[PDB]
Design a binder for this molecule. Sequence first.
Ligand SMILES: [Zn+2]
Lengths: 335, 1096, 601
Amino acid sequence: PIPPSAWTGPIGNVRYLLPSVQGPARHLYDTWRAAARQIAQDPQWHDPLNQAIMRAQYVTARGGSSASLKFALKVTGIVLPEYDDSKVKKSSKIYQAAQIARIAFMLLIAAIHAEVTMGIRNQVQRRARSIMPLNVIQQAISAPHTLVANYINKHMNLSTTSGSVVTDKVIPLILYASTPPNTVVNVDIKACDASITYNYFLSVICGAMHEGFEVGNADAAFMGVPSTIVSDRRSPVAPYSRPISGLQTMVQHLADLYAAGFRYSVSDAFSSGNKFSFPTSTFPSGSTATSTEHTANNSTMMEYFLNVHAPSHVKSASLKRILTDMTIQRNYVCQ
Amino acid sequence: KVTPIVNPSSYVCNVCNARFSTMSALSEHLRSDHRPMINNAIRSFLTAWDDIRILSPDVSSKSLSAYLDSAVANGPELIIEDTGLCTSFMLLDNIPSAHLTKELIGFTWFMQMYQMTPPLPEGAVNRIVCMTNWASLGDEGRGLEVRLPPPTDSSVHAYKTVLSRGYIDNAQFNPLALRSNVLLMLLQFTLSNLKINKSSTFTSDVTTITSGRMIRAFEGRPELLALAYPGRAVLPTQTKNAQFLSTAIADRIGRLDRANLIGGEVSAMVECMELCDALTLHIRETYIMLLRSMHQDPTQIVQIVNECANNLLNSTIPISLRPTILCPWFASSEDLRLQQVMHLVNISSNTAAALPLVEALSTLLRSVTPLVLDPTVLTNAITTISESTTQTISPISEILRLLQPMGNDYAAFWKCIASWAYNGLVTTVLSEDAFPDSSQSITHLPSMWKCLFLTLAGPMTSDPHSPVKVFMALANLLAQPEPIAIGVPGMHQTTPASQFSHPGVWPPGFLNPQLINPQQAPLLRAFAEHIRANWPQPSEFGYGSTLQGSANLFIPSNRMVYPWPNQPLPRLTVAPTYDSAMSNWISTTIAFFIRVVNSVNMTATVNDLTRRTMTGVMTAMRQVKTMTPFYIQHMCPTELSVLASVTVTPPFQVPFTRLVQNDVITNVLVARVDPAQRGDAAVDIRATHATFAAALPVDPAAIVVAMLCGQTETNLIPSHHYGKAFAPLFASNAMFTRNQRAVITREAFVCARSAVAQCQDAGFLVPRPLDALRQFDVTSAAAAEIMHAVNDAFKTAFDLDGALLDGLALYGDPRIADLSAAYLQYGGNVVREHVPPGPSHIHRALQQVESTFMAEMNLFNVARGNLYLVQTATNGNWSPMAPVAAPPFVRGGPNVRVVGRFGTIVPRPNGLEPQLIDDGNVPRDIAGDWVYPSDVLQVSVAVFRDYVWPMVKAGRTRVLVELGHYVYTLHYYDPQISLDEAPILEEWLSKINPAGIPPVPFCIPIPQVYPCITARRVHYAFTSENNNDSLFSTNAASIDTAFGENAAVSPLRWPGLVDPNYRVGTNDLPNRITLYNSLYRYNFTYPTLDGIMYVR
Amino acid sequence: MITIVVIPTAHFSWTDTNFLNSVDYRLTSQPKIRDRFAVYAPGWLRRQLDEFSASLTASELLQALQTIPIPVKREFCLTILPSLLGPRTFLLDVDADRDASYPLSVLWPQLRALALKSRLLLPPVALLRRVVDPGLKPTWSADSDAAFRALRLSRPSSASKPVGFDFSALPVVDIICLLESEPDDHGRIAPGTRLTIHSVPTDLLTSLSIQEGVRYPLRQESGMFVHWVLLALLMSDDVTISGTRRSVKLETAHASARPFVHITVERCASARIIDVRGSPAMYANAVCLTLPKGSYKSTIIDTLPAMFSDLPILEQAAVIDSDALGDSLRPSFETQFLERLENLDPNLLDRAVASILSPTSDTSDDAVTTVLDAFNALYREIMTPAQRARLPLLTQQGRVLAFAHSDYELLSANIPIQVVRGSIPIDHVVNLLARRNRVGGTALQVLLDYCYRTQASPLAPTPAGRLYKQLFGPWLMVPRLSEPLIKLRLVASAPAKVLRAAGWTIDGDPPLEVSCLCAYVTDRAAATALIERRLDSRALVTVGGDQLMFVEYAPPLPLVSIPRTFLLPVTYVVHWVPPQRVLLNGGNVSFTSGLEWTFDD
Ligand SMILES: [Zn+2]
């Protein structure tokens, strides 16, 4: 585990990793930082069509779980249309995002943390199973964590978003592997969704994204989240109030959301009326826009293994000759 | 329950039923019960622990240096005023005469009896203790202060400020780090005291005490009015204060010359006499002299703002008089250089630092620019060329594939411009994924249009190897038809044009196109003929104002080099013209690739009708009327001149180079350590300096869209469009914040490199007034605590938030702190433009405090001279601090013996006395006169206390304790009651460790008012040098002291009050401190920029 | 005339209250000082800035609002919008943090830097004077009027009186204390150190009746602090030296020679009103405070309702101590931690005590990392499955205040509870040395101190006093409230058919109800707008086979859901409202029911 002395003073909620620690956490901290630097530089955002694609990405991809705007009337008075005069399903696809168009994000992101965040359609007993995706405005506060994970997988995992990518990329790699020239190690990571916690991982990346988003304009909004005051506590003699960008504002709320966990609410119609919401450190399984972060760590943590860890830790002198010129751009493919 | 009113007289341990009269006794016994290896770390954690102090030299925050746009944006507090009176020495009464046991009527008289507060203290011991700002009722005190307790207390926590926490316990001071702790207190004495003296209000003395003198009107606080003015004392009886205050001259009080200017307006500067030391007043007047040094008059600051805005901003000043107008915002050109290197020392020298810094411009650069990109024009220019659709390959369609980014992706052009101000840190590199590969030929069509896009976007990117990559990307692409010779072996012609990033692998044909044969490679010589003739000329222009200065290091000041031959800004309606060097560069590439398309190699493969299409596209691309050739030449150098002084960091430039082999800037270098102190003066400059490795992969496909397709509003007045856009970012004085940063960056740098080199032995050329003091630990980590604590004080006194002086301990040796900068050229030009500090003011102030510390060490609870331990059983007066007799047995005297390094008693058998090893390694007998060094007595203390200290109590030996300077703690007693100093002095011996010593317990009798009978008493400890320099008055409220010393109020402390020969404006400042002086108070108004000028 | 721009602090009360109070309630003390302040904080401009914040960047958001003059008078004009900071107008600093929710709060480092260059920012004590002199302690004011002393009641109530008392609004004094050491044999003293307790409630200082300018004893007979200052230290946000900005944590006793034995409270630095709704706590059922070992949890569990016994603050059975869950097992967790360490190595324990208590820490890859993996193997074996069995005690009662040693067990054992990460400004590492006669001694207290510190997730520890202002804050109102309050409660009614299924001797045809959560209102009419409507949350009530009985809500109820005039307790246990109606319990059957606030008589 990372020692508490290895962290800096807090910048708001997040902390930075000291350079004095140089384990595999540092290469985690330094890959997610530089990938976060290439987004505050990237002018693909503040483009109206690019912002319309990301909001379309949360609605269309998954069927959604809940309506926590009934919970999010607690700080802002909403008229709460039930939409029984429109016959439409009250799932998170349509019933949430239509009501988001009235209220800005900044009057909502300060009070997003819900216990029935996800799992069931705004009622504790229905006929549906407790399922994976969460609120569209808590996916919107998880938006940079998707984007920095997309930049790690951009130069490595050219998936190209095509309907034929198993039969074009996976199948010939399957056939190029197992050939009599090369022997392979099919590396599988079991329970990877329940292996990304704030205790180790989500504290490092939220510190890496926050130092990575320090580049660029500190006075710059992002997707409707304005710049704000952070409370800097790094210097023990000089704490002060810093303006941080909206891209760093989302990481301040994301650190509060990752550390409290993810509130799975079980409301299955199989057992007679068992019903409880509870946190976990487990990511949703089938969310490909969120499970790409597991791809973002799979190539990254194999890269520290094949170059720094295993060429120093292994005792076989012959194997160090093999591990010298192994490279994840040549010798490791992940998805 | 009801809250307690009084502390418990008896403290319980609750472990054992042990009553304690003092909480300090309970604090040790609870600590005693906590105590193998486990309890030692538990006892030490309760021993060396305290966090209540402000300074933390032991907390070494690892890599706290991180530059921020908001860190400089908070300015330091300079204008902190002092409405009260500027003295640092309060006249503290240790022993009131009410504590005297015998009290008869009329011997002592108090002013409290007459409902009046005394001006001078009234007791039986009055010391002058250093308590800063005790009377300072100015606004918003400086944070750090030093408040020494009186000599009756311990007074060592003021001298544990560095090198002392973990090493020695609380009751001691570290004498081998004493010069560090004293001098760091003096820095804490100075920076606590950098205020501005402000006149409060002046009434006439309507009463009869001075009868009309313009008294300082302390309105709401009469408890300081009586202390400000001893001349207005009522003298009822013959108080010994009244013996002194009778000699007070009547007209030495209140204001003398109110230097007013305007009737009705507040005065500029009054000149009044009040109670103030001569030392604080010197610190105040050198602070105004610091504060005037960054002041400019408003006739000249409007010339600065207009020249900073290039005279296109409408800023007017009223021409009239303005009395009190300190507007302190102007560091010189030298001090901005010192912050600019300190900016480059704080940062990480990789690409993590310039990449925040480029977009600082590029956000503001896109905010103010008139150039509106609109790629429909170059699209409409290409899609309206004619092509038969029956072909397989479309040169129209296969190049718009290589043209369009999906997002905007056009701010990368503006990052490419903004890197020209920052070519020292970052060099924008042509993006390696945009080079055509070493697999496709020139017949492969999208590989050729990449080479057009590289050749067009060549001079935009600021990489020094840009034209050799432009030249090679075609020479790669036609390696089969046109072969040439490529440099050293290992780099062939089919090397993929990105590995030619070193000046040694430029091909010889590129340096000299005559080396390429036209009969062999005609198409490739003419591209070496192309680049060497049409690559743009690196011109230059000015920015900022010459009056303010600039933070240019390698460029001459207030200038900026620029990779294009600029022209001044037009004020009429502009139109896209083709006279630019851009249009010279653009038209000649198209004139070259019309030759490549219509060459012989493309003739044999590419069909003739689709060859006309490629010719038709480029000739259409050449004739696109775009504004960016006019923009980069005329309008863009104006806004790189304006935004270079409103962004948070000034431009750090290195001169551009058009294709010179020997002038390629390989490395740009900044060091934290000079090559003279460490023996590195002759080695290569890359080994002495740290190098800025930063790069930006600029995409050339987005440049050509920005370059060849850019337009502007038709009726553009570029003076008006810049005059309207720059107006919201000159209206504030926040532009002048970094000038206030740069002086505090200077004043902290000079005073920290002094404070390190004061504590070394003969470091930099700094004067060493405290060199008499003891300082042993001169290591790197010892001096790292010194610079970190000085850094911890300037961040506290001016209560700023940036990172000044951090990162000078990045390498870990701040004993060598010298800021240099250089850049190496491939020909071997080794420039080394290094920057010394400027003529600072606070470093002159601390140096004067250190000089007058030595004359009055006793005033800061530090006694000088050696220590005497002889048995002196007397009955009369006993003055340890002022020995009236001659000091006995000086070192080297008649049969005086000095103990060797171990402090070793050898035992002798059969009733023979134990012998002591002296300095000459000879065992000599105990009884006699001995000199002990301090460090010998720190380790021989158990041998001292058991073998030679009982020989002192018998009076048959006398021991000198040789040590230079030391904190003293005075102890007082009623001389009527008997006393023996040995329970008081063996407690001093019982805490001497090998690491430190306690302060020295001198026993002094309280001076009595009666000729009373006195007990015979035995004293041991007294000193050699006259160390009684802090005693103000021996006894005040009494009519006359009888038993003790008759040390009345010294008139040497008060020439300004009692001396008739006192001239106004004099002091004996390197000698003793005068406590009543004439001074100057101020009434400066502090205008904003709206209070100076008017900006529409 | 003089315009004073105010930027709101971190927990500014925009509630149904005065704007003057929420910046400095000293201004509303006297009528002649209330009338010297014209206020300008309109509601239309507050709504307008909340939607124009994300669109317009903060560099030119200043450029917009400075161009607006006096919009389309009294002495001082406290306004909410910035202006051109000329000599006639000013700015005020509170020496607090500026909030994140307020849109012009990001404009604070741009306005402050202009005020530093021209000496225009003025302390909040400068508003009380007759003429504006910017800065503390002037030459012309005595600074001794009763309007300066904010430790009195300052008369918050008058004839113009609202509907109900606001328990979300809370007076807070930034107090300046001088810590004074032991006097000499003569009446002499070292100068001592000044300290600023930044955010301590005033009603802790009025009920524990003190004045400022008078010396108080700091110590008890046992060496530990008096409960007066000790509550005021851990109600705080931060403790700094007064002149500077460096935070400081102070020991309790015997850790420093020459200790501090007196406090002369001398100056209220600022007198804000801090809101409660919007706390670090968000759920009315449960909140857990993760404090390190050596924190004074037992001081505020026991001794604070010992100082206030006439009024029900908390329920002792329904507050979970952190040390007690390791004491739940029949062998104690600290007793097994003796047995786990002793079986492996006695030598690494001899040098882990020196590396944890080191001033500077090395990698220590022999001493501490053998302790921690032995700790975590011991922890994962027993503590995480026991915490799952402790799930109904820590979230399923009416209202609980759980305590934890770290952030792990609240999340790893997957219990539904809001975790707040606490840091009190007392150095807890010397408290573990100060306490004695433990089961593992003082050596075991510092090893598993470091074990819970490494176990805790690295995130900013919020000041725990901000949590205690939500809990114990408005319970300091009721001694200065002149009106004896009334009692309310919730109802989860149960049918007799579900209460006769497994067997309960219950007399009566009307349904049996239960008290889920109580709350106190200072009148009756302020609850009449809320006693009528039912609450939109389903509440399932687990009734045990024994006397125990647990309540859960299908929809978690936001703490902010209750109105601002409710005084709900710190912790609360569930009981039947008639105990006598229940007889012959005989088994455990739960049921679901709605909620209605009602009057309890
Ligand atoms: Zn004891």
